[PDB]
Amino acid sequence: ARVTVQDAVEKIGNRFDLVLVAARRARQMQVGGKDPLVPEENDKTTVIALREIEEGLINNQILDVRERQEQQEQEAAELQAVTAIAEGR
Amino acid sequence: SVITVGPYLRLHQCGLPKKMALELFKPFIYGKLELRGLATTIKAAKKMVEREEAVVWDILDEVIREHPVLLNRAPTLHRLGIQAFEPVLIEGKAIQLHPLV
Amino acid sequence: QDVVLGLYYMTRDCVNAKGEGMVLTGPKEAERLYRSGLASLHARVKVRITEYEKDANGELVAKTSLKDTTVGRAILWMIVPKGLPYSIVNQALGKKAISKMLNTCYRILGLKPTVIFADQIMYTGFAYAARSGASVGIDDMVIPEKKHEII
Amino acid sequence: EIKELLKLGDLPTSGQIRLYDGRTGEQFERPVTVGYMYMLKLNHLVDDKM
Amino acid sequence: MQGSVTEFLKPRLVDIEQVSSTHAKVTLEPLERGFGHTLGNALRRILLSSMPGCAVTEVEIDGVLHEYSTKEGVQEDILEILLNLKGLAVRVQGKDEVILTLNKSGIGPVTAADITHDGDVEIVKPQHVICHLTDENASISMRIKVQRGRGYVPASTRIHSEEDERPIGRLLVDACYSPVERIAYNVEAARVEQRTDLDKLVIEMETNGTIDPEEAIRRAATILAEQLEAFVDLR
Amino acid sequence: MQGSVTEFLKPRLVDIEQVSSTHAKVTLEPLERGFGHTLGNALRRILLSSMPGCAVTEVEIDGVLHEYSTKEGVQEDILEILLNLKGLAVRVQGKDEVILTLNKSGIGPVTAADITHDGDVEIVKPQHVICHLTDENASISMRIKVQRGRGYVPASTRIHSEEDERPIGRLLVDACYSPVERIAYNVEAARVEQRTDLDKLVIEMETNGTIDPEEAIRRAATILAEQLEAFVDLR
Amino acid sequence: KPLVGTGMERAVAVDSGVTAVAKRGGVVQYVDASRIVIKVNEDEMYPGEAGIDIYNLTKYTRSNQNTCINQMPCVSLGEPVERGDVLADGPSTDLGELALGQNMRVAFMPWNGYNFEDSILVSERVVQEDRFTTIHIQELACVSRDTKLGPEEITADIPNVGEAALSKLDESGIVYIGAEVTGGDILVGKVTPKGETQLTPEEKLLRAIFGEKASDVKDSSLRVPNGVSGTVIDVQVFTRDGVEKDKRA
């Protein structure tokens, strides 16, 4: 099957939630640029996002990063753009 | 298309025809042609990969790396009527279905 | 079908012309007595006899037309648990436990382990299905000798 | 009648015969039933077209 | 061919992960359509008979007559002791019948390395434990015999007589001259940029000790090649 | 080098008895235990695909412009006639593409012996009947094309256009490059002054006529030797 | 024919309209694939013509199940036939009996997963030889109806196409017989007018100067379905008298 699906499943309170995380992670993965795991040993061939989550670095919360005023998820978007060089359309 | 058995085929993958992938998977081809030297622009690529072409065999397989599909039988009773599998370019016309499935 | 047929044929013991009780597994005098009797004319080869070291070395002897059984159960008890740990649970195959395995493995182990656990049984399931050849024929349908009497 | 007519010509006896594995090549454990069965191909309807 | 795709253009990259000297998983890929069984089998039937080697023929024990009895000052049982020797592997240059003696007492787990180093005999398995000695006069001395044969010769058809002819004390043991213990091959689907229907040959290797898994494959390949060189010159 | 008495001082006496360019039996003896049927399978595996060949590529007819046509003078339709040309074996020394000229009229069963003889092209089975011809001007001229390759290549993948550039009328046919059609091997027990447990390998190779038996068994031994040669340079 | 017959394989071909039966005894003079002429000696015994009765054998015609029915002659040159004798075979008949499938070497044995439920494994030799190669025939009708601008025309003059498309096509739009067509090639040369709404001010000027038949019609011909690729075996010929017998007829 897929690598460490069980461990992934354990990582989250709700099954359906894990899917949301990976999906959102995949979204950013393309748009902003690329990911946290790379140089030493990452995937091989051409491949995808769960490999990261299996790892410790990512953080998925109900409302991890937002803004003080108004519900703006957007502040996260701005910082990411500033930081990630590769650009999408 | 007609179904068949896929021994070496695992529950993670499925054995679908190669010619069939030329049609349904065309949208994912265009956005991968402009990266190589197969096609130049999106417009001029709509009159080449739209039919019988053998230059697409490679580029197409590069897209089916991590994009599973959904198999389905007409008489769909329970939930397992529509499952997901990793497409695999197999010669012929029949589709390979996992024995256990 | 074709998958369970290969494994089933493997873990079986043949019995033909046998007189003396041959239970070498346990006793000490039995192991020596029926050791030289194999090369004799009394004790046959396709019978109940178990005497050696490990499982890997057992198949080595069964290849030289010396041993027959007691190897199918050993070769299947190492190849399957090779691609997946936890051998305490991996030992109940049978015919009716073929569906109980996919229920007990998930509970104790996990989801990922079960994934690769299905690929192993599959390959060896159809592989030995041809190595044995369970071909059906007309003479295979053995007619009971008590048939003509009842009729 | 059948069994008697199998001992009149070539070659195997009782029906089954010892073959050899195409992959391994060693002795095929226990003979198997073989011969020439008259099969038939079925036509291809329009639905068969991909 | 270099231009057209073929098995020549895409050789068989061998990636070995040999561990210690008892087992080594050898992976190999990719393979064409019909070259996933002809490789794992051509070597399988050669490493179970044709492959030369030296095994245990018979071992004698001081004070002990049978093979199912017991020895004083021994934690294990002579049954298991002589049973483990079946795995113990040693190599000899050119000797029809060689006898290796051993003498050691007191508190100290005796091993195969304790055997006197013969000028024509090599241990290869020094760490191989044979017995664990304790106190209460743990005296144990044996003279294991090793013969240079081929394949597997039962201890019922062979049977030597170093001290078995008229005297008594020798105990026959199954001689598994063939170094390779077990060999199984598995064929799984491989992922390739081009075609997808590629077979994969992955065979594990088991050996008693006389030879290493790596050199066990090359020797099984050179013999198969010698037969191919027989169809060259006619006579 | 003789070295040790095993197989060095006991070579393999190969007595070849080739007939024509098809069936040619080859003897192999003596062989050790379980080593006869081992070579029979290995050689068979290679002599079914890894062996190139040259068969019919594209066929041309006088008044026929498509396979599903009919000629005036033959009871067999073109659809069936082409099939008898598919199995037609043709051997070429060293030519990429060669057209065979064929012509015959009047009553008389036209066989594969009516084909014009070429300096490099040789017929092996002039006994294969194509079709039956009758009176009333039964002229049947055909242009057989011969190309090289390996394995099976459908007539819808290659699609060649020889007599298609401007003129049209030809029809592409299947190409069977595979030379070997049937190869058997026996392992009857052989007896020698030494021991009795021997295996006698008698391989009966049969080629359609594209590649000579000697040339077939040789190329197979070369490729096979390379397969087992990959088990050397580790990485 | 099967390696085990009951005695009904020969009755089906004879009774039914499968095998051609002679009308009256005579001496065969010629044997063609399309016709089998029988010179009946109604008069004096001479090679000269007399009771000539031509027998037409259906070669390549389309049936209901898209199959092809053939009749390969059996009688050779000079063979006195009797009333009730066979002259030609049928769709699957060998001589006088019936032969649907074939006879191959069968070996029942669980190979390796493939033959799970109802699966069948066959060697690669089956594709190398045309033993199971059957003939399929598909019909692609193309009708031209009255357009709001006028009746459609059937000519080879079809813009928006390549050279290889009109190459196999004659000077009437209909492809010849025996063309190595494929997915994309034009089978029927039909045209269809556009309309004032689909017309541009640029092509409206040249419409009343360089003639009406300049840029009024567009591209609307029948092509080959994507995937299938065969050859033309039979073309249909029709030409209405009220529409004038143009270059087609």
From Swiss-Prot, chain A:
Gene3D superfamilies membership: 3.90.940.10
GO MF annotation: an example: DNA binding
Top-rank EC class of the record's enzyme: transferase
Enzyme Commission number, as recorded: 2.7.7.6
Source superkingdom: Bacteria
GO biological process per UniProt: bacterial-type flagellum assembly; bacterial-type flagellum-dependent cell motility; cell motility; cellular response to cell envelope stress; DNA-templated transcription initiation; intracellular iron ion homeostasis; nitrate assimilation; protein-containing complex assembly
The entry's keywords: DNA-directed RNA polymerase, Nucleotidyltransferase, Transcription, Transferase
Assembly mode: The RNAP catalytic core consists of 2 alpha, 1 beta, 1 beta' and 1 omega subunit. When a sigma factor is associated with the core the holoenzyme is formed, which can initiate transcription. The rRNA transcription and antitermination complex (rrnTAC) consists of RNAP, NusA, NusB, NusE (rpsJ), NusG, SubB, ribosomal protein S4, DNA and precursor rRNA; S4 is more flexible than other subunits.
Family membership: Belongs to the RNA polymerase subunit omega family.
Function: Promotes RNA polymerase (RNAP) assembly. Latches the N- and C-terminal regions of the beta' subunit thereby facilitating its interaction with the beta and alpha subunits.
Protein name: DNA-directed RNA polymerase subunit omega
Species in which this protein is naturally found: Escherichia coli (strain K12)
Name of the gene: rpoZ
Curated annotation (Swiss-Prot), chain C:
Effect of Q1P: Resistant to antibiotics salinamide A and B
Biotech relevance: Co-administration of salinamide and rifampicin or salinamide and myxopyronin suppresses the emergence of resistance to both antibiotics.
PTM info: Acetylated on several lysine residues in the presence of glucose.
Purpose: DNA-dependent RNA polymerase (RNAP) catalyzes the transcription of DNA into RNA using the four ribonucleoside triphosphates as substrates. Resistance to the antibiotics salinamide A, salinamide B, rifampicin, streptolydigin, CBR703, myxopyronin, and lipiarmycin can result from mutations in this protein.
Family that this chain belongs to: Belongs to the RNA polymerase beta' chain family.
Record text on subunit structure and interactions: The RNAP catalytic core consists of 2 alpha, 1 beta, 1 beta' and 1 omega subunit. When a sigma factor is associated with the core the holoenzyme is formed, which can initiate transcription. The rRNA transcription and antitermination complex (rrnTAC) consists of RNAP, NusA, NusB, NusE (rpsJ), NusG, SubB, ribosomal protein S4, DNA and precursor rRNA; S4 is more flexible than other subunits.
Protein's recorded name: DNA-directed RNA polymerase subunit beta'
Source organism of the structure: Escherichia coli (strain K12)
UniProtKB/Swiss-Prot annotation, chains E, F:
UniProt PTM: (Microbial infection) ADP-ribosylated on both alpha subunits by the phage T4 protein ModA. ADP-ribosylated on only one of the alpha subunits by the phage T4 protein Alt.
The entry's keywords: Acetylation, ADP-ribosylation, DNA-directed RNA polymerase, Nucleotidyltransferase, Transcription, Transferase
Disulfide-bonded cysteines: none
Positions of the UniProt region annotated as Alpha N-terminal domain (alpha-NTD): 1-235
Annotated region described as Required for interaction with Crp at class II promoters, given as residue ranges: 162-165
BP GO terms, sorted: bacterial-type flagellum assembly; bacterial-type flagellum-dependent cell motility; cell motility; cellular response to cell envelope stress; DNA-templated transcription initiation; intracellular iron ion homeostasis; nitrate assimilation; regulation of DNA-templated transcription elongation
Free-text comment about domains: The N-terminal domain is essential for RNAP assembly and basal transcription, whereas the C-terminal domain is involved in interaction with transcriptional regulators (such as CRP) and with upstream promoter elements.
Family indicated by similarity: Belongs to the RNA polymerase alpha chain family.
Functional description taken from the UniProt entry: DNA-dependent RNA polymerase (RNAP) catalyzes the transcription of DNA into RNA using the four ribonucleoside triphosphates as substrates. This subunit plays an important role in subunit assembly since its dimerization is the first step in the sequential assembly of subunits to form the holoenzyme.
Protein name: DNA-directed RNA polymerase subunit alpha
Organism: Escherichia coli (strain K12)
From Swiss-Prot, chain G:
Biotechnology: Co-administration of salinamide and rifampicin or salinamide and myxopyronin suppresses the emergence of resistance to both antibiotics.
Signal peptide interval: none
PTM comment text: Acetylated on several lysine residues in the presence of glucose.
Source taxon at top rank: Bacteria
Disulfide pattern: none
Family: Belongs to the RNA polymerase beta chain family.
Assembly behavior: The RNAP catalytic core consists of 2 alpha, 1 beta, 1 beta' and 1 omega subunit. When a sigma factor is associated with the core the holoenzyme is formed, which can initiate transcription. The rRNA transcription and antitermination complex (rrnTAC) consists of RNAP, NusA, NusB, NusE (rpsJ), NusG, SubB, ribosomal protein S4, DNA and precursor rRNA; S4 is more flexible than other subunits. In pull-down experiments interacts with CedA. (Microbial infection) Interacts (via flap domain) with Escherichia phage lambda antitermination protein Q; this interaction renders bacterial RNAP resistant to transcription pausing and allows it to read through termination signals.
Role: DNA-dependent RNA polymerase (RNAP) catalyzes the transcription of DNA into RNA using the four ribonucleoside triphosphates as substrates. Resistance to the antibiotics salinamide A, salinamide B, rifampicin, streptolydigin, CBR703, myxopyronin, and lipiarmycin can result from mutations in this protein.
